[PDB]
Amino acid sequence: AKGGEPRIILLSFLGVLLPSAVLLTLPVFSVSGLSITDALFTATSAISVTGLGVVDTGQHFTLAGKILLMCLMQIGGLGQMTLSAVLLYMFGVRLSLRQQALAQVNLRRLVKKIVTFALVAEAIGFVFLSYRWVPEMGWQTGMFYALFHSISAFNNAGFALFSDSMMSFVNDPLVSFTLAGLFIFGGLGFTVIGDVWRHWRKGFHFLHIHTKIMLIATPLLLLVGTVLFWLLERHNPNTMGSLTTGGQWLAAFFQSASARTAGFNSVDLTQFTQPALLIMIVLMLIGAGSTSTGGGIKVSTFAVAFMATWTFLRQKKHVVMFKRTVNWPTVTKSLAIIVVSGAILTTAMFLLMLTEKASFDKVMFETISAFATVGLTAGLTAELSEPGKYIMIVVMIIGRIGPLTLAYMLARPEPTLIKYPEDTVLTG
Amino acid sequence: KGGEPRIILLSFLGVLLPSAVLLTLPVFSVSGLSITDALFTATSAISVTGLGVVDTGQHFTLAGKILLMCLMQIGGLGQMTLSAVLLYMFGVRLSLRQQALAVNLRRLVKKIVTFALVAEAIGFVFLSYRWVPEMGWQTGMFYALFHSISAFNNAGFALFSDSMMSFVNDPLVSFTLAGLFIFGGLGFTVIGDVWRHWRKGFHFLHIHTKIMLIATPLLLLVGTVLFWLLERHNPNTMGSLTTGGQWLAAFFQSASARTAGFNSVDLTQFTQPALLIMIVLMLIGAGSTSTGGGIKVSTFAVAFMATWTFLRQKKHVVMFKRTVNWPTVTKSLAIIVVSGAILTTAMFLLMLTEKASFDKVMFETISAFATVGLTAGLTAELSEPGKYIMIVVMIIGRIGPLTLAYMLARPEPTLIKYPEDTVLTG
Amino acid sequence: KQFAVIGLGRFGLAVCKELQDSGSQVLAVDINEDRVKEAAGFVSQAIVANCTHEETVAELKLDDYDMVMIAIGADVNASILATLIAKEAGVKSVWVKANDRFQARVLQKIGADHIIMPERDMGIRVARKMLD
Amino acid sequence: KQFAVIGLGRFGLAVCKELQDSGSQVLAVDINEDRVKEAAGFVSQAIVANCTHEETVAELKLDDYDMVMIAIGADVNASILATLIAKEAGVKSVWVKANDRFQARVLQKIGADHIIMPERDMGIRVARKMLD
Amino acid sequence: KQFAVIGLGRFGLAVCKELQDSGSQVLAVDINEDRVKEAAGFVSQAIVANCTHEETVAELKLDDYDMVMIAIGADVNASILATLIAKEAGVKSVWVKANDRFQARVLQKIGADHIIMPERDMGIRVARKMLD
Amino acid sequence: KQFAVIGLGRFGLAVCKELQDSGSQVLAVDINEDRVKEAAGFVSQAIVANCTHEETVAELKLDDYDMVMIAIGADVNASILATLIAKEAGVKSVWVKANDRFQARVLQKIGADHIIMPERDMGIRVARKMLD
Ligand SMILES: Nc1ncnc2c1ncn2[C@@H]1O[C@H](COP(=O)(O)OP(=O)(O)O)[C@@H](O)[C@H]1O
Ligand SMILES: Nc1ncnc2c1ncn2[C@@H]1O[C@H](COP(=O)(O)OP(=O)(O)O)[C@@H](O)[C@H]1O
Ligand SMILES: Nc1ncnc2c1ncn2[C@@H]1O[C@H](COP(=O)(O)OP(=O)(O)O)[C@@H](O)[C@H]1O
Ligand SMILES: Nc1ncnc2c1ncn2[C@@H]1O[C@H](COP(=O)(O)OP(=O)(O)O)[C@@H](O)[C@H]1O
Ligand SMILES: [K+]
Ligand SMILES: [K+]
Numbered sequence A: 001a002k003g004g005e006p007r008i009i010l011l012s013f014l015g016v017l018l019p020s021a022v023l024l025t026l027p028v029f030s031v032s033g034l035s036i037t038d039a040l041f042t043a044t045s046a047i048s049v050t051g052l053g054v055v056d057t058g059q060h061f062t063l064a065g066k067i068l069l070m071c072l073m074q075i076g077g078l079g080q081m082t083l084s085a086v087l088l089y090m091f092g093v094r095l096s097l098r099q100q101a102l103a104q105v106n107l108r109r110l111v112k113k114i115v116t117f118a119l120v121a122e123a124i125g126f127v128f129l130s131y132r133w134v135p136e137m138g139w140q141t142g143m144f145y146a147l148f149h150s151i152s153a154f155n156n157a158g159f160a161l162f163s164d165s166m167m168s169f170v171n172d173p174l175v176s177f178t179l180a181g182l183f184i185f186g187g188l189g190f191t192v193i194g195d196v197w198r199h200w201r202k203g204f205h206f207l208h209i210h211t212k213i214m215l216i217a218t219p220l221l222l223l224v225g226t227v228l229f230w231l232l233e234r235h236n237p238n239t240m241g242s243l244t245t246g247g248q249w250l251a252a253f254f255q256s257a258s259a260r261t262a263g264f265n266s267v268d269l270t271q272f273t274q275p276a277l278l279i280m281i282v283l284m285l286i287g288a289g290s291t292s293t294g295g296g297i298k299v300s301t302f303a304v305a306f307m308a309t310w311t312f313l314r315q316k317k318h319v320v321m322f323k324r325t326v327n328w329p330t331v332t333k334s335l336a337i338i339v340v341s342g343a344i345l346t347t348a349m350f351l352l353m354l355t356e357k358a359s360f361d362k363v364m365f366e367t368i369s370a371f372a373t374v375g376l377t378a379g380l381t382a383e384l385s386e387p388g389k390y391i392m393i394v395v396m397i398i399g400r401i402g403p404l405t406l407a408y409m410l411a412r413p414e415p416t417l418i419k420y421p422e423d424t425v426l427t428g
Numbered sequence B: 001k002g003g004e005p006r007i008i009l010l011s012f013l014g015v016l017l018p019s020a021v022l023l024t025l026p027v028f029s030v031s032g033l034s035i036t037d038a039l040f041t042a043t044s045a046i047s048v049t050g051l052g053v054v055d056t057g058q059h060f061t062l063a064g065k066i067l068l069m070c071l072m073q074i075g076g077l078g079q080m081t082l083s084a085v086l087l088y089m090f091g092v093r094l095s096l097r098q099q100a101l102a103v104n105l106r107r108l109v110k111k112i113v114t115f116a117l118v119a120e121a122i123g124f125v126f127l128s129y130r131w132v133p134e135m136g137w138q139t140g141m142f143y144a145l146f147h148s149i150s151a152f153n154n155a156g157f158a159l160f161s162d163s164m165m166s167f168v169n170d171p172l173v174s175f176t177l178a179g180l181f182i183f184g185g186l187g188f189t190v191i192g193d194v195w196r197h198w199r200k201g202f203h204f205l206h207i208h209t210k211i212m213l214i215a216t217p218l219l220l221l222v223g224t225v226l227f228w229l230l231e232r233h234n235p236n237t238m239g240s241l242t243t244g245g246q247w248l249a250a251f252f253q254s255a256s257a258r259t260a261g262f263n264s265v266d267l268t269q270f271t272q273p274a275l276l277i278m279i280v281l282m283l284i285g286a287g288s289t290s291t292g293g294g295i296k297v298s299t300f301a302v303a304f305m306a307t308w309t310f311l312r313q314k315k316h317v318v319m320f321k322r323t324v325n326w327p328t329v330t331k332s333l334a335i336i337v338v339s340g341a342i343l344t345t346a347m348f349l350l351m352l353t354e355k356a357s358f359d360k361v362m363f364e365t366i367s368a369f370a371t372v373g374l375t376a377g378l379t380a381e382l383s384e385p386g387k388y389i390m391i392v393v394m395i396i397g398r399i400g401p402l403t404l405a406y407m408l409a410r411p412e413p414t415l416i417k418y419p420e421d422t423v424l425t426g
Numbered sequence C, D, E, F: 001k002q003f004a005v006i007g008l009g010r011f012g013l014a015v016c017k018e019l020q021d022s023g024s025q026v027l028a029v030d031i032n033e034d035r036v037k038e039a040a041g042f043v044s045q046a047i048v049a050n051c052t053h054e055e056t057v058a059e060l061k062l063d064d065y066d067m068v069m070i071a072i073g074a075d076v077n078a079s080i081l082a083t084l085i086a087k088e089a090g091v092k093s094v095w096v097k098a099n100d101r102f103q104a105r106v107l108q109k110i111g112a113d114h115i116i117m118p119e120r121d122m123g124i125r126v127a128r129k130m131l132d
């Protein structure tokens, strides 16, 4: 009697990965045609909405290829939010009936609201992006770029049609803020959007604990990242020293927001100070919300571990958040995800250094971005070797579904009839 | 709440500040140590990290080295003795609690000291057999005693300019030192369990003893094979050595990484795939109730086995046909996560204060937090804030794991509980 | 207005839901964490605590609240102890639910200010409602 | 020789400690985890399991063991149930502890091979001991 | 042809097994997940649901089913309330299992078409088998 | 001048409180850590120990104490065995608190110098208080 949520999660991704991979090889979608590994990498990047590119999205793909790319990252981003919310609903249904045996809307309405929320969010971002690019690029081309980037931003994909992804719009508030708002709400999570939508009149105090965590941790994650990036890169001529005072803050805020899974870059991370790469690595690992279009280990997982640590250092018996106790299984889930993620990350970084030769900071940054699904590159993907591409594909797949799958493994372990005696192991 | 955390910190700071104020005196140093340098040396000796801002053999006098043997002896042996004593009191309180619901300490301390003295005497004899012929009846004996004490206490302090790089091809000294910190880092609980119940067999040893006796050979073998594979073609570290010399060097680094801190090769010229392996080895560290450091092998074993249990969706973590209770798994995972958080903060602070590549800063931070003290060329150029950060990291690294383990054991009881609510993860 | 309701059975949760619907902030306290969870959904603050314990009641700071409602029904001993501790804490007004006349007299002697017998008072109300 | 002892009360732990002291491998099974921990110190393998559950017994592979001793004392229903399940699992020799003459006859009907009455048999043994 | 069984206890599961052997579609529904899994291999469709929930009974189109069997024994109130909800659901034929004579009286008046009392009904037949 | 109290229930804690207030050395010993912590503020030295363990009683130099009070009430075997161990340890005067008459008879035959039965003795005392 073990849970089957893990199997639905993997089969769903691979059930779309393989069809997407074979389509990209056809010359209809590529001007030159993609090899099997390149198409497998591109499909995995699109389906996981990582946004890593072995080839340039704007140039190597045709008009039909970009339309396919929008479909893949809409399936990868909104599809995870739709599936994760669907599996969350069924988990609650099983839990609710279990309580009644011992002692809410239907699924269709929930799925309709998720797709409705996605299209309206993209449509709002669509008109703002159209408002600027249509005058510059014409009508027919202007709407396409607005639609491609609004879909990419909401799905936390980071795919861009420009050679340098949004590096020409560092000093453009309308493009930066429209994109920033898109993956912030796209990455916030439908449970947070839904709870605020139905219970805002009650007040912040009566929102669900998960909603309160996401509504508080996200601004601090944005604010701390914005201040830290600005402080560490204000004097760096190569990235932010040449911008105006407002331009620096706009760039610092953009990368602070884009790190949490979007993957767009107003500046060059290739020329970032090391103390800034370490800050962004932490930001990428934390990721977006739990039931959103993108994410890494997720904000709530980091928040529980952050306050579990604070509880442990103060020797308190219970982990408390917003006058609510976080039960020990939840704490174990959050700590296990971080430890398991580090185990896979360390193995992936070690393999990358063997297949291709690069510095540790370049390898570590690329491994985190692929695992955290952010897709920000520090120059490793440009020179990635053939075996390195295979590792990145696996890391992108595991990083996309790992935290969610491992959570459901912890939720429903296989029941057993044989238990061994408890014995103590010394730790510390 | 438990006072084990308070006994652990007060005991360290109550030997660090006196040891620091003594190191400033010119009797122990040929040129004298600054307050920052003396504090760094005292922290490295008492925490037996082995990191050096000044050369041990040159900058210290004859009396200074005798103090250094006393300092690292206190660090290693006293940490082992205090851990055993606190474990004994924890067991006593647990037993009395069990009786309420439903050996001697002096003898234990005597066995700890006598085991240390016997091991150090064996290492001293083996080292004297090799150094006395070429160094004299007085200086060779001193070097043998110093290095045996350093090896058993998992300190890594060396009297040579290059710490054992001249004996990469010498099997006698390499195996003598290797056996000293493997046994010194095994844990006195394991040694006592093997000593008292070896006739019963391996099957009836305590679960901790089995975990150590299996993982330590596995960790040593994995480290040796990985270091040999990754560094056999590197001319600057192991390419010039013979086939036996390469394996001896690889085994020596695999063992020294687990807290000793001696180096028969240059880690400054190591391939990055090998520095990652050595970072992983340093983080794991030595045994729980031993002279070494790290997250400890038992913690890494419970997390590795818990991970396998979670990936297989099994209800209980089972090790050697014994269930590992959920508080133990939570302790291990929390130790790893908190260690990672402090490590990330320390690397960020070092990167702010000092200008170096990420691999060097990360390696130095891991070596100082784990008390291995292996240097990758960054300690020699430490600045004043860098030295302060390293001192703090060495202090927290030495006492952090056991302290955090005991906080999780005895949290403050409460009279107010808030309702349980679910938080989405992953 | 701040209210504290101790015991979250049928009467206690009905008083809390009414008090919070009327815009007042209520504290819900119960030893059964299961019932504290339903209250926490709509109650300003819900706490799992034992209100027969003097130190626990001191931690709750019940003297701050204007009125304390004690709705422990089945355990008459717990009701008496909670009323005694609340009065010794220094709460101005204590309302206690009593399921027996003898318990009501004991609570009057203890120092309870208003005592509600839900069965008898509801019988009187229903009789008046049928008459008119 | 391999023995399985079910129930780790005063009788079951005495059989395990005597069997293991002679070099035989013993499997100790009980539902009380405390007694399984106590036996796990000296018993070759100790398992927390419910032996009245027929699917659980198949997992224990009691058919492999030469002799199965069932030492469930207080719960007579569990004693007959465990004897029945062990017999249906293909155990060659089942020894059962019985606290009454009525339980012993039911166990004889079930298929127990040797039935031990601790009070009566020890009474006979001490009576012989005083004589000689 | 098409039947529904609510409650998968010992009595309800026995109905499901015999109904399947005659090649009939059976909808087995039970609040407890474990009991639904047991009948999952013996019925056309096994669903975990609370048949006391009026909207759930509306979704499970029980009016399409030829006969609906309510086999809830322990909680007398659930069987009475589930019987009523099935009547407003449009079920023409409702068979209810009752364990007590007082429950069988209520079920008759609320409109159950067939009341089954397994102890009383088996008592009559076993006597008849004894006679012949 | 120097006294020992074993068992820190309501009776033993009262003995410790009066003895220390009068100005004497009192070693309070109880297997339960909570009661030892409660009495730690009052007595000169409070130790968590099992006084049924012979080696623990040997380590605690109870023979140096002028009087030893054994105040274990719930488990009669614990009180009897503690009295025997204290008498073997060389304690010249042992005062034991007994709750039942059979326990008092056993303790008298063992050799306890003073047997205290709180209910009977306070019965006599309050009767004398009522008379005058
Ligand atoms: N010491 C106590 N402190 C707080 N709440 C208590 C205490 N003792 C009992 N309660 C709770 O008070 C309530 C009394 O209601 P009760 O009559 O038991 O149930 P109901 O009214 O639902 O039939 C219960 O929720 C009970 O758990
Ligand atoms: N169904 C069962 N499966 C396995 N062990 C059982 C079962 N029922 C009882 N036992 C164990 O059998 C042991 C002997 O029972 P009992 O006679 O009550 O204890 P004791 O012999 O110490 O008085 C108990 O410790 C109990 O845990
Ligand atoms: N509201 C309900 N909806 C569906 N099934 C129910 C409901 N209430 C009880 N049941 C089921 O009806 C069955 C009747 O079992 P019953 O004889 O009452 O108890 P037991 O299983 O202890 O013998 C059980 O399997 C129970 O889970
Ligand atoms: N073997 C023992 N050694 C020391 N103290 C004991 C032992 N057994 C019981 N006690 C203590 O003696 C005290 C007296 O118990 P009891 O008369 O039952 O008081 P209460 O009814 O308040 O528990 C208990 O609190 C218990 O902790
Ligand atoms: K991305
Ligand atoms: K060291």
Ligand SMILES: [Mg+2]
Binding pocket: C009, C010, C011, C012, C071, C073
């Ligand atoms: Mg009530």
Ligand SMILES: [Mg+2]
Binding pocket: D009, D010, D011, D012, D071, D073
């Ligand atoms: Mg027995």
Ligand SMILES: [Mg+2]
Binding pocket: E009, E010, E011
């Ligand atoms: Mg049944």
Ligand SMILES: [Mg+2]
Binding pocket: F009, F010, F011, F073
């Ligand atoms: Mg008492």
